[PDB]
């Protein structure tokens, strides 16, 4: 049996060269726009 992890590159998110920093900026930017609209 092949799991979801083996089927697809779900783990590629953890292989970003700059660590999880870029993912935080994506979430932060969504928080920034929502903060202004709210």
């Amino acid at each position: 049996e092949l799991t979801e992890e083996e089927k697809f590159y779900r783990n590629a998110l953890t292989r970003m060269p700059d660590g999880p920093v870029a993912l935080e900026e994506s979430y932060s930017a969504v928080m920034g726009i929502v903060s202004e609209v709210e």
Partner: protein, 247 residues
């Protein structure tokens, strides 16, 4: 509308928690911890993992100690005042108990073991335990009612159900060591103090063990070896026939 934040299972994204809960939004937040009953053996390991992660997250928040103790006093006042921050343990895929009976030879003693473990953990963290099955749509309305009650302060009326194996529900404050002792009566082989792992075993899943790397010899060592080579140049049948020979 209640904000919903689902964190990915890997700790690599645990730092995202700062965007799910802030100091201003902490008291309004209700914490939900998922327990997979299709994989019961990791349930407490996962629970101490994620609860410890939450404790570490609250550490980085730097709440004033007076405010933290105020929150503790509010929560405990909500706790002892119960009559017949918040943490709610929700069990998912409890219908997989039906698998545990057929694939791992489980019985009521094992289920009593795991649910007594879960209730002792809930006592440790002062949480409310509930069993659900999205496949069978069990306790979903009960869940929704309890969530709305504990977040918005709405009323709640459902009692504690602790007899059925796969539909247990325990609101906060109901459980106690004396009340948990009822399940220990059913035990006939294990004890309450026995380790989780020894009794309930993590199966050794038969992962494809990749074979050893077969490597061709280097040409130089191979030719050196070849130079070295060149220069130096039934019972049970017998048991039956003895049995019919002794007589």
């Amino acid at each position: 509308r209640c904000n919903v934040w689902i964190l990915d299972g890997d700790l690599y994204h645990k730092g995202l928690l700062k965007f799910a809960v802030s100091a201003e939004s902490l008291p309004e937040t209700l914490v939900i911890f998922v327990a997979d009953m299709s994989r019961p053996w990791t349930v407490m390991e996962s629970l101490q993992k994620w609860a410890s992660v939450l404790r570490e997250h609250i550490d980085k928040m730097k709440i004033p100690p007076e405010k933290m103790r105020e929150l503790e006093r509010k929560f405990v006042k909500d706790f002892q005042d119960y009559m017949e921050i918040p943490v709610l343990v929700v069990c998912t895929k409890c219908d997989a108990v039906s698998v545990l009976e057929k694939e791992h030879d489980y019985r009521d003693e094992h289920l009593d073991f795991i649910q007594s473990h879960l209730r002792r953990f809930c006592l440790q963290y002062g949480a409310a335990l509930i069993y659900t099955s999205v496949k069978e749509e069990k306790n979903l309305d009960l869940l929704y009612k309890y969530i709305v009650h504990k977040t918005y302060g709405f009323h709640f009326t459902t009692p504690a159900l602790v007899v059925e194996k796969d539909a247990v529900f325990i609101p906060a404050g109901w459980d106690n060591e004396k009340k948990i002792a009822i399940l220990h009566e059913n035990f006939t082989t294990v004890k309450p103090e026995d380790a989780y792992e020894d009794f309930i075993v993590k199966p050794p899943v038969r992962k494809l063990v990749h074979d050893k790397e077969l490597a061709a010899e280097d040409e130089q060592v191979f030719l050196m070896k070849q130079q070295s080579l060149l220069a130096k140049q039934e019972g049970v049948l017998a048991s039956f026939f003895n049995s019919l020979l002794s007589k």
